[PDB]
Design a protein around this ligand. Structure first.
Ligand SMILES: N[C@@H](CC(=O)O)C(=O)O
Ligand code: NA
Ligand code: NA
Ligand code: NA
Ligand code: NA
Ligand code: NA
Ligand code: NA
Ligand code: NA
Ligand SMILES: [Zn+2]
Length: 867
């Protein structure tokens, strides 16, 4: 079983490879790879060259065309001794794409051949320095059957091509930018292609090419549009242009993650490309936008400046996630973006940071690097970049970006390099701030206030601490940017000031305990605290219900209104989960329902914001409110809350639902906001009087002129168990079974059903004609959704959920360890549950621990969990 690697052990490579010339004789069963690398020794004279390789059949090794005798293969490697200081290495080896079920390296996706090399997949293709601080100029020649693989793509530009006998042909590509090998890509296959052009602001014309399976061309234009929007935004906001002549994107159906930023040749999960208005939701559209942007933004933050080592992953991922969010936010509703990203942080990433798998955004120890493409590295990473932006402001932040690229373009850099550039450009000290890179867990910030009428001073007393995590026992105070705003009783902002002088509204919370005093506060204020979620922390402040509804009515930033609503609900969620556990039904003060009534009827509230306030926290967000999670109580309480609101607000709900009717479907931000509000009302209405509800939901499903409205109705039928549910579900199956992406939404609904027999229906679905264990999207939509988004069923008291997940992981461990490791995440959270649940979950993990051929991916998580 493999060994952890440690950040502190980094050392510069003994050898570099500057140029590599690859040839593939491609065939599904047996591909022959010939790799000619120019190498240069940088370390000691007697150091052997250690090349990484996995599942390779070595055919030959030459050094300057001399067959080499001074080498040996060992586990995962080829070690070559006694070398000159500079030489040409030539390796020939074979691999087998068709046997590759793990989907890393060169593998088969339906009838196409494609690659996934990040993190360490290139070593599955040939023996190489598969580490991202080795940067080479690639030239890639691909030879293949002309009829099966008429398109032969790799990074860069086409520089040669020819025909051969026996119906073969080849294309050779060259990419002038030196790159680590995780950015290599190869695709071969037969595709429809949508071609278009973007002209950069300095007048460079870029050819854009989107390759999709035959018959999918009608689902390509949105993705192409989003790519152009991405290129334009990166110019306007960051000053960055694309740096090559062609930009290819290939949509493939078998892909473990969302997409991959391979230079000039991104490969995407089809989920994040294909859309038409009858197949895809507004959410899909905005996800496609996000992910096309993200991969495009990587061209600079990732490709032109790469990562010295994998412990620096957040250097590219946090930053690129921050960029995708700023892009979505600039183009769409900034408040909705921020809100959703906060919901992800509080509801999903916080849970990871309290799990056995916790780590800092820049990890210190890793066994299987594929386990570290996480909510923490990505989402918390972005929150960290956003704290830098909070602290410097946009103008200085952009100077730091410029200094970062000027210093590091064409190299592999570290997180620390990025911070240093931000500090040097801005003259803001971020010494203490760096601790966000090295410390795990979610800080808890405790605030106490005092208003003094004699002195006309408001004083905040702010504390922080981060509990210990399983990985780190010592924790220290962070540099928390803690934004506030103070409101008088009409809703006007009170200027923050002290001893004659303006005070910055971003307070520097750097110690365990400190006090901040504001002068010239002539009237007792209501504060907004942690505005725009200015740091990724838990806030402990004893809000009154009235302060919160005041904020819902007057806070200047949309986000603060949302967040005040979430704090209002939180008290009553906790109340009612304790009640539920004692058999007591839901209790909600009248004035709380009235605060939501007011939001429904305030015509001055942006519908984008109203919709989010009227979207109740998910069962994951509700779970973060508790020390011990009771998932059955949480789910029953969320249902009961929804039915209570539905009853108390029925007439207003119906009215706003009807008022937001739109006969034209458009993918435009104002329209999306109205629809989102409409459908937020629908969710409550689905839990009204049974007959009204059944009629309204069924009508929406049947008369929808787009998938957003049809899915929302179908989902409501499922959630509220309405009489029409089985018929609507069967209709959607009959209509859409041949379409995987669309059936995924139905699999999710099945898996997250509140029906008593959900598990049984889920097992049955393992034989459904649209399901297959060969496809990660199907896996995640049916199995992963059950385990991860239906905690109430997953955690059924008879333990049937755990046994089901064990059976599924027993298969996936061998087939596709990365998807297995995604799916195991719910079981590793056992210590958040009660003793009886812990016990069955430990047993399930001990069973897994005992699997023959346990993957490293699962071994890592399972041993942290059982600790
Ligand atoms: N989203 C993919 C790759 C990326 O960051 O673009 C992953 O989890 O690796
Ligand atoms: Na190099
Ligand atoms: Na990536
Ligand atoms: Na990259
Ligand atoms: Na905007
Ligand atoms: Na991966
Ligand atoms: Na507002
Ligand atoms: Na949670
Ligand atoms: Zn990324």
């Amino acid at each position: 079983q493999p060994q952890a690697k440690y950040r502190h052990d980094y050392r510069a490579p003994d050898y570099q490879i500057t140029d590599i010339d690859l040839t593939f004789d491609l065939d599904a069963q047996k591909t022959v790879v010939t790799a000619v690398s120019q190498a240069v020794r940088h370390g000691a004279s007697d150091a052997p060259l250690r090349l990484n390789g996995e599942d390779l059949k070595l055919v030959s090794v030459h050094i300057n065309d001399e067959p080499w005798t001074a080498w040996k293969e060992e586990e995962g490697a080829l070690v070559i001794s006694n070398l000159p200081e500079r030489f040409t290495l030539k390796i020939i080896n074979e691999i087998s794409p068709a046997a590759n079920t793990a989907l890393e390296g060169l593998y088969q996706s339906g009838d196409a051949l494609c690659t996934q090399c990040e993190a360490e997949g290139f070593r599955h293709i040939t023996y190489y320095l598969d580490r991202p601080d080795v940067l080479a100029r690639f030239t890639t020649k691909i030879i293949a059957d002309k009829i099966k693989y008429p398109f032969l793509l790799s990074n860069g530009n086409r520089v040669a091509q020819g025909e051969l006998e026996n119906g073969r042909h080849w294309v050779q590509w060259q990419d002038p930018f030196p790159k680590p090998c995780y950015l290599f890509a190869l695709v071969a296959g037969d595709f429809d292609v949508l071609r278009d052009t973007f002209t950069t602001r300095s007048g460079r014309e870029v050819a854009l090419e989107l390759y999709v399976d035959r018959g999918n061309l009608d689902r390509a234009p949105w993705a192409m549009t989003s790519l152009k929007n991405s290129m334009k935004w990166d110019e306007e906001r960051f000053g960055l242009e694309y740096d090559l002549d062609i930009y290819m994107i290939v949509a493939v159906d078998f892909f473990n993650a969302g997409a991959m930023e391979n230079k000039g040749l991104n490969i995407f999960n089809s989920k994040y490309v294909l859309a038409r208005t009858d197949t895809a939701t507004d959410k899909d559209y905005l996800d496609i936008e996000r992910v096309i942007g993200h991969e495009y933004f990587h061209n600079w933050t990732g490709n032109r400046v790469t990562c010295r080592d994998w412990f620096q992953l957040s250097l590219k991922e946090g930053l690129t996630v921050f960029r995708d969010q700023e892009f979505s936010s600039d183009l769409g509703s900034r408040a909705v973006n921020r809100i959703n990203n906060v919901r992800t942080m509080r509801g999903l990433q916080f849970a990871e940071d309290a799990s056995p798998m916790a780590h800092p955004i820049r990890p210190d120890m890793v066994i299987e690097m594929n386990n570290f493409y996480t909510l923490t590295v990505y989402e918390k990473g972005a929150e960290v970049i956003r704290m830098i932006h909070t602290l410097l402001g946009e103008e200085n932040f952009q100077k730091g970006m410029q200094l970062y690229f000027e210093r590091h373009d064409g190299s592999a850099a570290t997180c620390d390099d990025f911070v240093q550039a931000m500090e040097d450009a801005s003259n803001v000290d971020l010494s203490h701030f760096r601790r966000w890179y090295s410390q795990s867990g979610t800080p808890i910030v405790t605030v106490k206030d005092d208003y003094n009428p004699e002195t006309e001073q408001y004083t905040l007393t702010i504390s922080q601490r981060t509990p210990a995590t399983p990985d780190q026992a010592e924790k220290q105070p962070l540099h928390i940017p803690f934004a506030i705003e103070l409101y008088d009783n009409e809703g006007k902002v009170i200027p923050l000031q002290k001893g004659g002088h303006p005070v910055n509204s971003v307070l520097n919370v750097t110690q365990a305990e400190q006090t901040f005093v504001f002068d010239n506060v002539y009237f007792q204020p209501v504060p907004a605290l942690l505005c725009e979620f200015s740091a990724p922390v838990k806030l402990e402040y004893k809000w009154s219900d009235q302060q919160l509804t005041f904020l819902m009515r007057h806070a200047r930033n949309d986000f603060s209104r949302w967040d005040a609503a979430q704090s209002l609900l939180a008290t009553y969620i906790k109340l009612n989960v304790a009640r539920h556990q004692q058999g007591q039904p839901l209790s909600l003060p009248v004035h709380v329902a009235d605060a939501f009534r007011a939001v429904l009827l305030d015509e001055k509230i942006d519908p984008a914001l109203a919709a989010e306030i009227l979207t109740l926290p998910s069962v994951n967000e509700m779970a973060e409110l508790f020390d011990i999670i009771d998932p059955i109580a949480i789910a029953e309480v969320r249902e009961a809350l929804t039915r209570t609101l539905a009853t108390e607000l029925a007439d207003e709900l119906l009215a706003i639902y009807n008022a937001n009717y739109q006969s034209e479907y458009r993918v435009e931000h104002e329209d999306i906001a109205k629809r989102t509000l409409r459908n937020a009302c629908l969710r409550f209405l689905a839990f009204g009087e049974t007959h009204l509800a059944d009629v309204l939901v069924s009508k929406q499903f049947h008369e929808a002129n787009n998938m957003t409205d049809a899915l929302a109705a179908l989902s409501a039928a499922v959630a509220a168990q309405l009489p029409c549910r089985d018929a609507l579900m069967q209709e959607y199956d009959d209509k859409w079974h041949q379409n995987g992406l669309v059936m995924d939404k139905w699999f999710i609904l099945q898996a997250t059903s509140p029906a008593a027999n959900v598990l049984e229906t889920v097992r049955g679905l393992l034989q459904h004609r649209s399901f297959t264990m060969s496809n990660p999207n199907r896996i995640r939509s049916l199995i992963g959704a059950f385990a991860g988004s239906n905690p109430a069923a997953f955690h059924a008291e008879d333990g049937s959920g755990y046994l089901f997940l064990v059976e599924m992981l027993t298969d996936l461990n061998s087939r596709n360890p990365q998807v297995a490791s995604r799916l195991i995440e719910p079981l590793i959270r056992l210590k958040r549950y009660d003793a009886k649940r812990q016990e069955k979950m430990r047993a399930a993990l001990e069973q897994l621990k005992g699997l023959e051929n346990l993957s490293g991916d699962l071994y890592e998580k399972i041993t942290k969990a059982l600790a």
